[PDB]
Coordinates of C-alpha atoms in Angstrom, one line a residue:
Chain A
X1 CA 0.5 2.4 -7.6
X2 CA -1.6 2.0 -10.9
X3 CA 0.0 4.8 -12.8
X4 CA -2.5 4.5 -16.0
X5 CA -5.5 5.2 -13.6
X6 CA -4.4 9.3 -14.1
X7 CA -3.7 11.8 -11.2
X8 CA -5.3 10.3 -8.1
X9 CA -5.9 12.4 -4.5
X10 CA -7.6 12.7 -1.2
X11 CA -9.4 15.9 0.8
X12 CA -7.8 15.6 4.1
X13 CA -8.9 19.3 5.1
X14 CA -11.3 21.7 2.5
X15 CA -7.5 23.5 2.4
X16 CA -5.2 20.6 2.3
X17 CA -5.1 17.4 -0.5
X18 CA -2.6 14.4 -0.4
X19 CA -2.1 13.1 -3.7
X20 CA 0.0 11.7 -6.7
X21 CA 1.7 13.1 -9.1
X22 CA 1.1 15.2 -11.8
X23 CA 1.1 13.5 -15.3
X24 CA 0.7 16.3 -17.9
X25 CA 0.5 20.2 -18.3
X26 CA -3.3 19.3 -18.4
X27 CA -3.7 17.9 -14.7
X28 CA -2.4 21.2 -13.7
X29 CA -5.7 23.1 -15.5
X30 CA -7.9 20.3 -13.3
X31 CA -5.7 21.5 -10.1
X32 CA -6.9 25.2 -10.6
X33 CA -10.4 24.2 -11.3
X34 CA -10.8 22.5 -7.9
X35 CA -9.2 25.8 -6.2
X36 CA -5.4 24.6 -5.8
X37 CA -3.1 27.1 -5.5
X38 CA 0.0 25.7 -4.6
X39 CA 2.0 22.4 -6.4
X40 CA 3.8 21.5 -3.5
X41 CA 6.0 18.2 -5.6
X42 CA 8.1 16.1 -3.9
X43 CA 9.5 13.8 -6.6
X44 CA 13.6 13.4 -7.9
X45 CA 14.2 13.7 -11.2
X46 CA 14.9 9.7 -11.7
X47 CA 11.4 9.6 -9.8
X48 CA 9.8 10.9 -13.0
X49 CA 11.8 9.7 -15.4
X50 CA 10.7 5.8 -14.8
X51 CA 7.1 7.1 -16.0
X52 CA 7.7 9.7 -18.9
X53 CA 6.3 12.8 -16.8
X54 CA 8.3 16.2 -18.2
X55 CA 8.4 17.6 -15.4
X56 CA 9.4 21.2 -17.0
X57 CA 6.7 21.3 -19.0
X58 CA 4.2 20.9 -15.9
X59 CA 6.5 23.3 -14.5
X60 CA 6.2 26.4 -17.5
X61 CA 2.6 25.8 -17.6
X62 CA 2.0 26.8 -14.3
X63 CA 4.2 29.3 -14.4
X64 CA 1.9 30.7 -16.8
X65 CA -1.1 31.7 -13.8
X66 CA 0.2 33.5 -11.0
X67 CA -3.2 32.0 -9.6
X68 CA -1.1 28.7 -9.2
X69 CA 2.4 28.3 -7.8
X70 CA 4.4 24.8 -8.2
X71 CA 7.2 24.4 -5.6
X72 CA 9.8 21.5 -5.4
X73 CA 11.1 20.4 -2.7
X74 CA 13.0 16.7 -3.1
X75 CA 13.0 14.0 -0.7
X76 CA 14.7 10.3 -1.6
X77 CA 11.8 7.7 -2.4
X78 CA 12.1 4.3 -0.4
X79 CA 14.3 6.4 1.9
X80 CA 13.1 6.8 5.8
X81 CA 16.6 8.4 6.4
X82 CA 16.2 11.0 4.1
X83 CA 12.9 11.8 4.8
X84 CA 13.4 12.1 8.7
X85 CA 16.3 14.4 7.7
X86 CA 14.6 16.6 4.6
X87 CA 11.2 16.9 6.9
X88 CA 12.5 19.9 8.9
X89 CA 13.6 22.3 5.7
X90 CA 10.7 21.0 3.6
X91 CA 7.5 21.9 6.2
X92 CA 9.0 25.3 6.5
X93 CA 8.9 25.8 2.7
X94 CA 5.3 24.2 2.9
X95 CA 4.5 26.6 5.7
X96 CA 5.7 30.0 3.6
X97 CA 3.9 28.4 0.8
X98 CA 0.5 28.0 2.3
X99 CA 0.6 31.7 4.0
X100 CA 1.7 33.3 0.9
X101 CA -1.1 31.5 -1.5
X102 CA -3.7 30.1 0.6
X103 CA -6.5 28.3 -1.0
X104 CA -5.9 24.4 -1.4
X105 CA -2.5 22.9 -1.1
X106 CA -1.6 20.3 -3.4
X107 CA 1.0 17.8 -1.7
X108 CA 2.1 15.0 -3.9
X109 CA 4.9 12.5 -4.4
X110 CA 4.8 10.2 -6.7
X111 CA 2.6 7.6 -5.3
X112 CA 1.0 9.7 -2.8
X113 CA 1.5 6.7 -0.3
X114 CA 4.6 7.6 1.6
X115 CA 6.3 11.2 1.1
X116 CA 3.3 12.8 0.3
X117 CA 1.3 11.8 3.3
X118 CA 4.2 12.3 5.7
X119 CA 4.8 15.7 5.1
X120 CA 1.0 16.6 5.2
X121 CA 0.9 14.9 8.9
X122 CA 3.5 16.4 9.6
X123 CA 2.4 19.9 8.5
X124 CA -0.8 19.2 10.6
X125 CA 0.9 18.1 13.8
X126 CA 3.4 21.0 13.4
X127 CA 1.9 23.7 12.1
X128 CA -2.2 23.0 12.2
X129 CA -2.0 21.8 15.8
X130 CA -3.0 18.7 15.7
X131 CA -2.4 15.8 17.7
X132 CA 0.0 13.3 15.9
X133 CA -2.2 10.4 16.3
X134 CA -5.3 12.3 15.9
X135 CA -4.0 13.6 12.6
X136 CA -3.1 10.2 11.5
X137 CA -6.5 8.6 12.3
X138 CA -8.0 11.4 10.0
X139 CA -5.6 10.3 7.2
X140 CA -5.9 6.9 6.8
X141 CA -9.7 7.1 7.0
X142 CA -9.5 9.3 3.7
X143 CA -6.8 7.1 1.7
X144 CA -5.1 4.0 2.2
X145 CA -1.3 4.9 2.6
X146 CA 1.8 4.2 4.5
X147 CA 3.2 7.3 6.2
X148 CA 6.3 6.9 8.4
X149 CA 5.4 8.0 11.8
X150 CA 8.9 7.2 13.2
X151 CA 10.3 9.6 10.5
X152 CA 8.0 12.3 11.7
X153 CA 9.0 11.6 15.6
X154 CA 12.4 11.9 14.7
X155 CA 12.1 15.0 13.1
X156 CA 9.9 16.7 16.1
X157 CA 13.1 15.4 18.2
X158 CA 16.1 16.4 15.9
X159 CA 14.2 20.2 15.6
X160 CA 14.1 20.7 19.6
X161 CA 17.1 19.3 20.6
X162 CA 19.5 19.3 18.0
X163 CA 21.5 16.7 15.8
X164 CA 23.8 14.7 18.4
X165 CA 26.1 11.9 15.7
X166 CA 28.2 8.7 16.6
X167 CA 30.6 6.8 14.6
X168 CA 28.9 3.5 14.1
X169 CA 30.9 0.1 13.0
X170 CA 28.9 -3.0 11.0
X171 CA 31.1 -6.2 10.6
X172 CA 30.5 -9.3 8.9
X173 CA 32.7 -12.0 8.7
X174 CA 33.9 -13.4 5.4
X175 CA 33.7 -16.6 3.9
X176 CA 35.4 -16.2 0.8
X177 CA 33.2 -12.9 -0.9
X178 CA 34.2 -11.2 -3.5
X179 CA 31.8 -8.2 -3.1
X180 CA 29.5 -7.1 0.1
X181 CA 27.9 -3.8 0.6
X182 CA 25.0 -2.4 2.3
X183 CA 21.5 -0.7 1.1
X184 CA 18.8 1.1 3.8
X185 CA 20.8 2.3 6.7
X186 CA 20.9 6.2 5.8
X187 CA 21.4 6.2 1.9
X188 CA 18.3 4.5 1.6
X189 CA 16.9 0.9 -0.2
X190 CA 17.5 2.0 -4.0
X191 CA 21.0 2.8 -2.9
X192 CA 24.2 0.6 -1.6
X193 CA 27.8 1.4 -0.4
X194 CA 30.4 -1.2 -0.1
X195 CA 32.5 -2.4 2.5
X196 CA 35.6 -2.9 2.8
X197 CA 38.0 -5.8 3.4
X198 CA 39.7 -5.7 6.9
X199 CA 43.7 -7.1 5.9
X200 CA 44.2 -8.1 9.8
X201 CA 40.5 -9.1 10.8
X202 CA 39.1 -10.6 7.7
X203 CA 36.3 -9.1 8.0
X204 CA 33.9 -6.8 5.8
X205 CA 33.9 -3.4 7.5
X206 CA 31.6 -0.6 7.3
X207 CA 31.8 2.9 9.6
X208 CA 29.0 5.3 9.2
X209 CA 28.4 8.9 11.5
X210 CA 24.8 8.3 12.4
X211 CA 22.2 10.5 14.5
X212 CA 20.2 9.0 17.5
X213 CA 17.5 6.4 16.4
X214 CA 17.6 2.9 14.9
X215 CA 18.4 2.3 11.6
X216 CA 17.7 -0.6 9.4
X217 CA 19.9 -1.8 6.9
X218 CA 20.7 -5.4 4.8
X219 CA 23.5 -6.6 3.0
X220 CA 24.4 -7.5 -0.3
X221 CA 26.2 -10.5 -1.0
X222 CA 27.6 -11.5 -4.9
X223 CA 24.8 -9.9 -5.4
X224 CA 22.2 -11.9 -2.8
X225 CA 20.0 -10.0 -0.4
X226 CA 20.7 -11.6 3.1
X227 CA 20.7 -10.2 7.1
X228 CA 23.7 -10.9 9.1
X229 CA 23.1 -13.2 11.7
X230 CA 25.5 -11.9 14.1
X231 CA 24.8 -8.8 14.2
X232 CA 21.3 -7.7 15.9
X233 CA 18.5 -8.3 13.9
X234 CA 14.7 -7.5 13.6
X235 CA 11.4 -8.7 11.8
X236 CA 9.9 -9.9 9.7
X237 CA 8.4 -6.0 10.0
X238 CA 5.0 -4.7 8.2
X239 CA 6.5 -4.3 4.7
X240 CA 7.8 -8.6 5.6
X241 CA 11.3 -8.2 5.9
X242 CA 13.8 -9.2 8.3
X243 CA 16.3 -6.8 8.7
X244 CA 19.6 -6.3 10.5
X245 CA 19.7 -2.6 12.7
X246 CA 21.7 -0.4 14.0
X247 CA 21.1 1.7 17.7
X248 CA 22.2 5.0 18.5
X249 CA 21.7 6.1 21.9
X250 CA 23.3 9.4 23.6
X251 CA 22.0 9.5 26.6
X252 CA 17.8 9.3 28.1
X253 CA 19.5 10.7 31.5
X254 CA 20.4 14.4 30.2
X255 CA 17.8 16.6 29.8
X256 CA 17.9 16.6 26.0
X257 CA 17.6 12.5 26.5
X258 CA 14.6 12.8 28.7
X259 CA 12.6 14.9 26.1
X260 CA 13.8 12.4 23.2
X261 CA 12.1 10.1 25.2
X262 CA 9.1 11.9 26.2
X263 CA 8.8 12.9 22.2
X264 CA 9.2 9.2 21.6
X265 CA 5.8 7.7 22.3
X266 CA 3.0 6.8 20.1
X267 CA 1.6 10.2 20.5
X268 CA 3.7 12.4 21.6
X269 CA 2.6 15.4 23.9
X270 CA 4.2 18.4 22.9
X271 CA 5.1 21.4 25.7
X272 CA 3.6 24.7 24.8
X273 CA 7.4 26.0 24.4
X274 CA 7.9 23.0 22.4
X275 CA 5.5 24.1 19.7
X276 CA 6.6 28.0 19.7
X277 CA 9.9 26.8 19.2
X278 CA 9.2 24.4 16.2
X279 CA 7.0 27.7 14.7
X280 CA 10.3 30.0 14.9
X281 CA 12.4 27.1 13.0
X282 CA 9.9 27.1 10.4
X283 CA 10.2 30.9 9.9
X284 CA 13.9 30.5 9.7
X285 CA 13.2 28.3 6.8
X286 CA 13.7 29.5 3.2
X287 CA 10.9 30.7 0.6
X288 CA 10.2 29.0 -2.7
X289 CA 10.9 30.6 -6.1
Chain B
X1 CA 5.8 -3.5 -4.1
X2 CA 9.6 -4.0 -4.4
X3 CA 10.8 -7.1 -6.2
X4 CA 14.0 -6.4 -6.1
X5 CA 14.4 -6.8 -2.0
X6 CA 13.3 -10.7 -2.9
X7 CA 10.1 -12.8 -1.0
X8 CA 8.7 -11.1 1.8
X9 CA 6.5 -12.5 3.9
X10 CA 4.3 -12.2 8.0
X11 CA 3.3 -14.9 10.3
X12 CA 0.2 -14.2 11.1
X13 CA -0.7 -17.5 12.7
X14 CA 2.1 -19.6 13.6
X15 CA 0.9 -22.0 10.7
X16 CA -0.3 -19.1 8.6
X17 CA 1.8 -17.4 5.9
X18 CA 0.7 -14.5 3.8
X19 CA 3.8 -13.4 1.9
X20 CA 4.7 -12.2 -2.0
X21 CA 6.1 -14.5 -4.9
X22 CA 8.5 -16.9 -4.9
X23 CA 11.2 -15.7 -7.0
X24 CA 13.9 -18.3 -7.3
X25 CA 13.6 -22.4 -6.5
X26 CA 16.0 -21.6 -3.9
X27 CA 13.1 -19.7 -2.2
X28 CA 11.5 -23.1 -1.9
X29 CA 14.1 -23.9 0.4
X30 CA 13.6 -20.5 2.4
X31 CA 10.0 -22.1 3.1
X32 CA 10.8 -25.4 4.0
X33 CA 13.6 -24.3 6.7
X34 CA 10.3 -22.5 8.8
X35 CA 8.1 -25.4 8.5
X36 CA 6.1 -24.8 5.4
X37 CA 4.3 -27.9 4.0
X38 CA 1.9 -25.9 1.4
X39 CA 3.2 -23.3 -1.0
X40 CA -0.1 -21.7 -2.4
X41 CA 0.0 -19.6 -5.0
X42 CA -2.3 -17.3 -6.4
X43 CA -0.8 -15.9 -9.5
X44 CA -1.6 -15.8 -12.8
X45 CA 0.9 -16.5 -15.7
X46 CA 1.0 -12.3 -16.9
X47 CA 2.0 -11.5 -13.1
X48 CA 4.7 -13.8 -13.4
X49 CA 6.0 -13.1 -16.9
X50 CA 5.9 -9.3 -16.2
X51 CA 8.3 -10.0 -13.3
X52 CA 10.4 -12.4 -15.5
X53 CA 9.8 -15.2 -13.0
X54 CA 10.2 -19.1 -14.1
X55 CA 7.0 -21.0 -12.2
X56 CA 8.1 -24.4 -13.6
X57 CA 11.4 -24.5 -12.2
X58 CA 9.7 -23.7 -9.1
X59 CA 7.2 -26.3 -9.5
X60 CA 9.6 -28.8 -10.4
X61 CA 12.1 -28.1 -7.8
X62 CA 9.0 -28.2 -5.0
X63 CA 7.7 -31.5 -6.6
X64 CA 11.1 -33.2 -5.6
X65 CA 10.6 -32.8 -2.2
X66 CA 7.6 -35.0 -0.1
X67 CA 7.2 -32.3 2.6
X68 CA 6.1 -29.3 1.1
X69 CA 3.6 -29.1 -1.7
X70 CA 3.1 -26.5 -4.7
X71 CA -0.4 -25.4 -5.6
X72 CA -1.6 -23.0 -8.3
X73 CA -5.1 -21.9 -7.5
X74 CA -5.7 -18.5 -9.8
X75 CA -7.1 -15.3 -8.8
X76 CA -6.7 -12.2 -11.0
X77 CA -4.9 -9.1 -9.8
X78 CA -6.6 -5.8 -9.6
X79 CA -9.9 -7.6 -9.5
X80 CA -12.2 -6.9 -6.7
X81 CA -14.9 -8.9 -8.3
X82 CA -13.1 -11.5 -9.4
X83 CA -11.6 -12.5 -5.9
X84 CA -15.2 -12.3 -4.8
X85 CA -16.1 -15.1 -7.2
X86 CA -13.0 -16.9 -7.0
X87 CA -13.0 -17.1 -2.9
X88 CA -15.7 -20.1 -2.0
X89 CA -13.6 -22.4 -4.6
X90 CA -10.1 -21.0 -3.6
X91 CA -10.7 -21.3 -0.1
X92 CA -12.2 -24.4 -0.5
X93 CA -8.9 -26.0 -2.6
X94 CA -6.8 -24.2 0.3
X95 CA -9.2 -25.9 3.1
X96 CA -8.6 -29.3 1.9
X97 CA -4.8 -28.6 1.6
X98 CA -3.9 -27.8 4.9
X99 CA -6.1 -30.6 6.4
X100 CA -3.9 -32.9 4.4
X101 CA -1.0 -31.8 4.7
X102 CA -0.7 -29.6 8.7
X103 CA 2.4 -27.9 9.3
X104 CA 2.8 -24.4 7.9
X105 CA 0.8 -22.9 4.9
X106 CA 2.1 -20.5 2.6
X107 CA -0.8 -17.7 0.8
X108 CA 0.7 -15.8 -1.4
X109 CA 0.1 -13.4 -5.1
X110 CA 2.7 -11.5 -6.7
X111 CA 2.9 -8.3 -3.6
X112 CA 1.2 -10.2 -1.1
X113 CA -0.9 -6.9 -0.3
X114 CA -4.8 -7.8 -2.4
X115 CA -5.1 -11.5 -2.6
X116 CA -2.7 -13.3 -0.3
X117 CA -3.8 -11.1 2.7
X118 CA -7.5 -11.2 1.5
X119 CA -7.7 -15.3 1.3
X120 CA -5.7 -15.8 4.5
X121 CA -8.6 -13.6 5.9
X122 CA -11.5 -15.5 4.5
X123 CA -9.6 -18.1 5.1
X124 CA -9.4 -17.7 8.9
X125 CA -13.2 -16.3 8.9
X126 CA -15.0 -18.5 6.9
X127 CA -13.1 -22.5 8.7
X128 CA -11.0 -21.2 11.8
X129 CA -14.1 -19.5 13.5
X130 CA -12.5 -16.0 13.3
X131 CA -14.6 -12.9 13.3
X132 CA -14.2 -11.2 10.3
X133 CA -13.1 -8.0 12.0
X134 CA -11.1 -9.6 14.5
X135 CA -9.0 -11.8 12.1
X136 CA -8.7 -8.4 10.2
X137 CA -7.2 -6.9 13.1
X138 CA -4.7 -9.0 13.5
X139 CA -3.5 -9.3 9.9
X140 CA -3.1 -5.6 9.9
X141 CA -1.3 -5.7 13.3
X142 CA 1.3 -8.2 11.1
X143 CA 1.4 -6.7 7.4
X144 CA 0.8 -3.5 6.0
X145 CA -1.8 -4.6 3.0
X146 CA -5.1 -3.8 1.3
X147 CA -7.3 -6.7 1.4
X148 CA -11.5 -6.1 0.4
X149 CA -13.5 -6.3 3.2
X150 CA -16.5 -5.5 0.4
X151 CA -15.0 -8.3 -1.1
X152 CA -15.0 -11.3 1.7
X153 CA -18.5 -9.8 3.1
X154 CA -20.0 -10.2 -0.5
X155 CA -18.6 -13.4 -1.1
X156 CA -20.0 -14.6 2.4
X157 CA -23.6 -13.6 1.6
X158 CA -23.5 -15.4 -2.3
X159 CA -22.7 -18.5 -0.6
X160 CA -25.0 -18.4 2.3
X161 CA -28.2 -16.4 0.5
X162 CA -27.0 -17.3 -3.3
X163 CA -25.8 -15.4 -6.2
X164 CA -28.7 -13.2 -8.1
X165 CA -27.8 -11.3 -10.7
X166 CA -30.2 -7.8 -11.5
X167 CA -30.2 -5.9 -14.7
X168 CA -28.5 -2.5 -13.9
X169 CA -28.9 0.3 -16.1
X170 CA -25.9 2.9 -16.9
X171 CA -27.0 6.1 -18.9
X172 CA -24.9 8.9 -20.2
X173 CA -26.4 12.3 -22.2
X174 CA -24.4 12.6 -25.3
X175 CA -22.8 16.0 -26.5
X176 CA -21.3 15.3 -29.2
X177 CA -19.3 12.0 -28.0
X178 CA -18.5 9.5 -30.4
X179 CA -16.9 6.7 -28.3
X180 CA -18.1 5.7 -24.3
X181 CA -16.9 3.1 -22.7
X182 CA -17.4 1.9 -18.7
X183 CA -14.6 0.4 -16.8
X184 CA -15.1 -1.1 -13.2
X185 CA -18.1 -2.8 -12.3
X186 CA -17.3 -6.5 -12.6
X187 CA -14.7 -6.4 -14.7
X188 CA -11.8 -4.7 -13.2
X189 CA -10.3 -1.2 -13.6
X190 CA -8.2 -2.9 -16.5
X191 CA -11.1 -3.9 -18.8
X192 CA -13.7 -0.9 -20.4
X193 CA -16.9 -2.1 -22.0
X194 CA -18.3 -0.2 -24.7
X195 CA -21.9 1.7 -24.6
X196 CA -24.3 1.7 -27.4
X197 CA -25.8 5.0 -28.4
X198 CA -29.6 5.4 -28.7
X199 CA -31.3 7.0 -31.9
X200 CA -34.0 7.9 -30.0
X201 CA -33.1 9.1 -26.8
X202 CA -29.3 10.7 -27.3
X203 CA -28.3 8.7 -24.2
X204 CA -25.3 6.6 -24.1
X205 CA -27.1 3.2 -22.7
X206 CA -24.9 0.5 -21.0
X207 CA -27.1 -3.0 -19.4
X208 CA -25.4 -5.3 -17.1
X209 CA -26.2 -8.2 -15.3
X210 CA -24.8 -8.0 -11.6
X211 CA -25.3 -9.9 -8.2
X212 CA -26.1 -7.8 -4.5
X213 CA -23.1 -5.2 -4.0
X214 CA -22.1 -1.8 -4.6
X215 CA -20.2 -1.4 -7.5
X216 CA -18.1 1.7 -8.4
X217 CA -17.6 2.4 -12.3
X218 CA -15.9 5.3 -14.0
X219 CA -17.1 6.6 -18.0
X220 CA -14.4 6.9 -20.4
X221 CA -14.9 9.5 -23.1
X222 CA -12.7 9.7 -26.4
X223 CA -10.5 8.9 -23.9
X224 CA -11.0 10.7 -21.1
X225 CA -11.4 9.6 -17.3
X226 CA -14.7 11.0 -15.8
X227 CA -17.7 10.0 -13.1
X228 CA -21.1 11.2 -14.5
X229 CA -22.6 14.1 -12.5
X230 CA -26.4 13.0 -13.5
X231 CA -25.8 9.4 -11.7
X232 CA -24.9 9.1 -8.1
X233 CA -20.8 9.4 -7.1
X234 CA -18.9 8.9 -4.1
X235 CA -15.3 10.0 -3.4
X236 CA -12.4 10.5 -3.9
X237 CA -12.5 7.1 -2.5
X238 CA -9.6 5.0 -0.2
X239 CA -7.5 4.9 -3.5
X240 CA -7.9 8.9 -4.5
X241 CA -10.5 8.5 -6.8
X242 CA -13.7 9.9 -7.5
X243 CA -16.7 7.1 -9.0
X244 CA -20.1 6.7 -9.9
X245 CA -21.9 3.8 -8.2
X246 CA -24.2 1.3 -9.3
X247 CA -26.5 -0.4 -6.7
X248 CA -28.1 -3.7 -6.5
X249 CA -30.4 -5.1 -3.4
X250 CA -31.8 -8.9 -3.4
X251 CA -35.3 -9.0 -3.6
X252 CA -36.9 -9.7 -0.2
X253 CA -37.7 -13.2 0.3
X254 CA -40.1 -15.3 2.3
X255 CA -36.8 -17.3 3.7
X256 CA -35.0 -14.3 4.9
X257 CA -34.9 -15.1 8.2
X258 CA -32.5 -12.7 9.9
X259 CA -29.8 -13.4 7.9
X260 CA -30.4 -10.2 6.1
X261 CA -29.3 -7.7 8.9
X262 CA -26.9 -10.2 10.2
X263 CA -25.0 -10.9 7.5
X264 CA -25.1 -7.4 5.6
X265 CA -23.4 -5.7 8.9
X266 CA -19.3 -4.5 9.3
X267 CA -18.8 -7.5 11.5
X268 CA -20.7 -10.2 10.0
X269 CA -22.8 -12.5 12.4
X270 CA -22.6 -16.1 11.6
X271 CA -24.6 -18.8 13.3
X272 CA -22.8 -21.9 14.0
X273 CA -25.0 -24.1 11.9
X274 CA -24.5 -21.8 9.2
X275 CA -20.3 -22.2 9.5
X276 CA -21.3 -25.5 9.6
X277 CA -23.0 -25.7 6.7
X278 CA -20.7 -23.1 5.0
X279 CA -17.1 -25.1 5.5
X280 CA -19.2 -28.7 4.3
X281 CA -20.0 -26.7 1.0
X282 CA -16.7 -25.1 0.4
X283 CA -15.5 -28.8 0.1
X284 CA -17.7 -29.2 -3.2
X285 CA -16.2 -26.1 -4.4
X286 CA -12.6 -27.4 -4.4
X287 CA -10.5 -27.5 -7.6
X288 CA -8.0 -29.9 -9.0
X289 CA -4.4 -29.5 -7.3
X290 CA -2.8 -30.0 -10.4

């Protein structure tokens, strides 16, 4: 992400841009002039602290033209956990947002490669009726980024059928450690959570209440990246890691299984009822401001 | 890219690597316990000092070992035009390499999402008798990256048809400017050049001497970012930006042939004689391993 290069941004839709974010008061003026009418930002606060941008400033001067409303809704960089759980309650504020101010809508993160383009796909699927895949092919052939399709699955699924958690255990056997924790899993990869020393098993234990899914996750060592080879393990993936993972799995028998798995493939077709039903959780969903 | 996670890196072929920096010497290790007999690296000194990365202890540490090999073969970063000179001589060093030495081959830059991924794929096109798209295909299957299919096509064509370089023109109306500058072309988004004003006209005037391509440029005016609307533009392009273009076109020769429409396509068309001919050449454009 070349950050000196200014405010960069794509036309997916005459109504609908995926971009990066905002770097002064001024970008918002060059916003208005190409008919944006909502700031829909996505970055934390540490987000835009790493690059200097006052975000309150950006803030005040669009609060300034009522022709121009800025909106944040966080969601954890680096963090497919977090995103796959923040999706639901962020479309819906997206969906108000665009109904109340129309025009263009200005999605951004801080990169506009990963949080950014996932909620716009997944405004489009949801809301613009789109086909997942369909949608997707129309992004990527407007700007090169990395949107988490998994996350936005997962989402569809956790929406229709409902958040069903297991107590999940990860072991690793010591050999003399001082320290071990975790990062990824569901606190994301700029985050890690120790362990704890079993007195009876001498082993590094770990318990975490997790949704249905798989869940990557690596530990942390004295202070050395490594995967557990004991434990199940998977790659080296797209981004060229090799990570250990985690499976949650209810059960694909039930009814609330079978459309989990149904909703699980590469394009997922979406029932009729399935779609009227994601429509009313998104008008459940509270308004900006 | 995230340094902090340590080397990443895809199989692509089983004896075909395209992965980030090593980090630490005992990443040298990492290589050797999957077969890796050539560590090829593409970075330059400022990509490694920005990441605080020592190069000599991982030079030195590689050096004391017989079965896998170190070699430093520059490219810059954030060049597009760059790696589309520097291809035919790194490919050719990396050709020579893994002929000597088999086993495993380690590309890599500093992310292992421009150059790696793009020299592996020229790589793979230009001596394993890959299609350009098809050997594209499969990278992409393996590794999220960004590699410059402009790039390895443009390349292809100055080594086949030769490098030409045409007098471009770049003009921009003054109103009241004082400094204009033009980054892009062929010198990377992190270089500007400076325009010189004309007395008589009241046109910023910029001339440049460039080979066949389509380059995109950007004006910068007392500071300020902007594509001129009185020249052609395109975008916001793949990245989310909006350029002016500059267009140059060979003069038509009476040794054409076909190669013209052949090579100029998505999927470049390559007769065998001229892989041939093209691997025999790359060869003579091989650097010293140092």
């Amino acid at each position: 992400y070349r950050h000196e290069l200014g405010m960069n941004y794509n036309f997916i839709r005459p109504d609908l841009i995926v971009g990066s974010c905002l770097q002064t008061p001024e970008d918002v003026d060059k916003l208005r002039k190409i008919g944006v009418k909502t700031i829909f930002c996505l970055q934390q606060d540490p987000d835009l602290e790493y690059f200097g941008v006052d975000i309150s400033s950006i803030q005040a001067y669009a609060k300034k033209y009522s022709d121009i409303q800025h909106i944040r809704c966080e969601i954890r960089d680096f963090d497919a956990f977090d995103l796959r759980m923040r999706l639901p309650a962020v479309v819906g504020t997206l969906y108000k947002a665009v109904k109340r101010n129309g025009g263009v809508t200005y999605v951004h993160s801080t990169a506009g490669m990963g949080r950014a383009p996932a909620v716009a796909l997944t405004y489009m699927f949801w809301v613009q009726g789109y086909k997942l895949m369909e949608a997707h092919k129309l992004l990527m052939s407007k700007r090169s980024c990395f949107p988490k399709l998994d996350a936005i699955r997962n989402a569809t699924i956790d929406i229709l059928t409902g958040l069903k958690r297991k107590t999940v255990t990860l072991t690793l056997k010591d050999k003399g450690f001082s320290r071990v924790e975790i990062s990824g899993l569901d606190i994301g990869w700029g985050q890690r959570i120790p362990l704890t020393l079993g007195k009876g098993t001498g082993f590094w234990i770990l318990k975490r209440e997790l949704p249905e899914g798989q869940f990557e996750y690596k530990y942390i060592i004295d202070g050395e990246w490594t995967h557990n080879e004991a434990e199940p393990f998977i790659g080296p993936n797209k981004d060229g890691h090799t990570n250990n993972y985690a499976k949650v799995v209810d059960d694909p028998t039930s009814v609330d299984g079978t459309t989990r798995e149904r909703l699980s493939s590469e394009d997922p077709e979406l029932l009729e009822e399935e779609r009227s039903k994601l429509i009313q959780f998104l008008e459940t969903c509270s308004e900006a401001e």
